[PDB]
Design a protein around this nucleic acid. Structure first.
Length: 69
RNA sequence: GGGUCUGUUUACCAGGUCAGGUCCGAAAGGAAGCAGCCAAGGCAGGUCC
Protein backbone atom coordinates (compact mmCIF):
# COMPACT_ATOMS: atom_id res chain seq x y z
CA UNK A 1 0.00 0.00 0.00
CA UNK A 2 1.33 3.43 -0.99
CA UNK A 3 0.52 7.01 -1.97
CA UNK A 4 -0.72 5.73 -5.31
CA UNK A 5 -3.32 3.68 -3.43
CA UNK A 6 -4.00 6.55 -1.04
CA UNK A 7 -4.48 8.89 -3.99
CA UNK A 8 -7.04 6.41 -5.34
CA UNK A 9 -9.31 7.18 -2.39
CA UNK A 10 -11.85 20.71 -1.20
CA UNK A 11 -9.60 19.23 1.50
CA UNK A 12 -9.46 16.40 -1.00
CA UNK A 13 -8.30 18.68 -3.83
CA UNK A 14 -5.22 19.97 -2.04
CA UNK A 15 -4.27 16.49 -0.91
CA UNK A 16 -4.22 15.38 -4.52
CA UNK A 17 -2.27 18.54 -5.31
CA UNK A 18 0.44 17.42 -2.90
CA UNK A 19 0.61 13.97 -4.39
CA UNK A 20 0.63 15.27 -7.95
CA UNK A 21 3.94 16.98 -7.17
CA UNK A 22 5.82 13.89 -6.08
CA UNK A 23 7.86 11.58 -8.31
CA UNK A 24 6.89 7.98 -8.91
CA UNK A 25 9.58 6.86 -6.48
CA UNK A 26 8.21 9.10 -3.75
CA UNK A 27 4.62 7.87 -4.12
CA UNK A 28 5.67 4.21 -4.05
CA UNK A 29 8.17 4.54 -1.20
CA UNK A 30 6.95 7.54 0.91
CA UNK A 31 9.49 7.02 3.68
CA UNK A 32 12.14 8.60 1.47
CA UNK A 33 10.41 11.97 1.66
CA UNK A 34 12.53 14.08 4.00
CA UNK A 35 13.43 17.78 4.35
CA UNK A 36 14.54 18.68 0.83
CA UNK A 37 11.75 16.80 -0.97
CA UNK A 38 8.90 17.92 1.32
CA UNK A 39 10.06 21.41 0.45
CA UNK A 40 10.18 20.62 -3.24
CA UNK A 41 6.73 19.09 -2.94
CA UNK A 42 5.21 21.91 -0.91
CA UNK A 43 6.37 24.75 -3.17
CA UNK A 44 5.53 22.68 -6.21
CA UNK A 45 1.96 22.29 -5.00
CA UNK A 46 1.50 25.77 -3.50
CA UNK A 47 1.38 24.23 -0.04
CA UNK A 48 3.30 24.61 3.18
CA UNK A 49 5.72 21.93 4.38
CA UNK A 50 3.48 21.30 7.38
CA UNK A 51 0.67 20.70 4.88
CA UNK A 52 2.79 17.93 3.39
CA UNK A 53 3.62 16.61 6.84
CA UNK A 54 -0.07 16.21 7.68
CA UNK A 55 -0.70 14.50 4.34
CA UNK A 56 2.07 11.99 4.95
CA UNK A 57 0.74 11.35 8.45
CA UNK A 58 -2.79 10.64 7.24
CA UNK A 59 -1.22 8.28 4.73
CA UNK A 60 0.95 6.62 7.38
CA UNK A 61 -2.11 5.96 9.56
CA UNK A 62 -3.80 4.17 6.65
CA UNK A 63 -0.66 2.29 5.62
CA UNK A 64 -0.75 0.92 9.19
CA UNK A 65 -4.30 -0.28 8.69
CA UNK A 66 -3.33 -2.23 5.57
CA UNK A 67 -2.17 -5.48 7.25
CA UNK A 68 -4.02 -4.75 10.51
CA UNK A 69 -7.39 -3.72 9.00
C1' G B 1 37.26 11.84 -28.23
C1' G B 2 33.81 13.83 -31.95
C1' G B 3 29.07 12.69 -35.50
C1' U B 4 25.11 9.11 -35.33
C1' C B 5 22.00 4.90 -33.89
C1' U B 6 20.07 1.67 -29.94
C1' G B 7 19.15 0.17 -24.82
C1' U B 8 19.18 2.12 -20.12
C1' U B 9 19.62 5.89 -16.20
C1' U B 10 18.63 10.85 -13.67
C1' A B 11 13.58 14.30 -6.90
C1' C B 12 14.98 20.23 -6.16
C1' C B 13 20.71 22.72 -7.35
C1' A B 14 19.28 28.75 -12.90
C1' G B 15 16.30 23.88 -20.57
C1' G B 16 10.82 23.45 -23.33
C1' U B 17 5.87 22.56 -22.26
C1' C B 18 4.43 22.93 -18.10
C1' A B 19 -1.55 18.65 -16.10
C1' G B 20 -2.89 19.54 -10.96
C1' G B 21 -2.22 23.09 -7.21
C1' U B 22 -0.40 28.20 -6.09
C1' C B 23 0.78 33.65 -6.04
C1' C B 24 -0.59 39.14 -7.72
C1' G B 25 -4.84 41.79 -9.47
C1' A B 26 -11.58 45.07 -8.36
C1' A B 27 -11.31 43.28 -13.46
C1' A B 28 -9.02 42.99 -17.78
C1' G B 29 -5.17 40.01 -17.07
C1' G B 30 0.01 38.96 -14.80
C1' A B 31 3.87 35.86 -12.56
C1' A B 32 6.39 31.83 -10.47
C1' G B 33 6.44 26.64 -10.97
C1' C B 34 6.32 20.46 -8.88
C1' A B 35 5.25 15.61 -11.10
C1' G B 36 4.78 13.91 -16.38
C1' C B 37 6.55 14.07 -21.17
C1' C B 38 10.14 16.03 -24.21
C1' A B 39 15.10 17.95 -24.43
C1' A B 40 19.62 17.32 -21.99
C1' G B 41 23.47 14.94 -19.05
C1' G B 42 25.29 9.83 -17.02
C1' C B 43 26.48 4.37 -18.22
C1' A B 44 26.97 0.99 -21.95
C1' G B 45 26.68 -1.30 -27.03
C1' G B 46 26.68 -0.65 -32.86
C1' U B 47 28.59 2.22 -36.65
C1' C B 48 31.69 6.13 -38.64
C1' C B 49 35.82 10.26 -38.69
Amino acid sequence: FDLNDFLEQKVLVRMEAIINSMTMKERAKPEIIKGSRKRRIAAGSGMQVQDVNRLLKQFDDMQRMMKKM
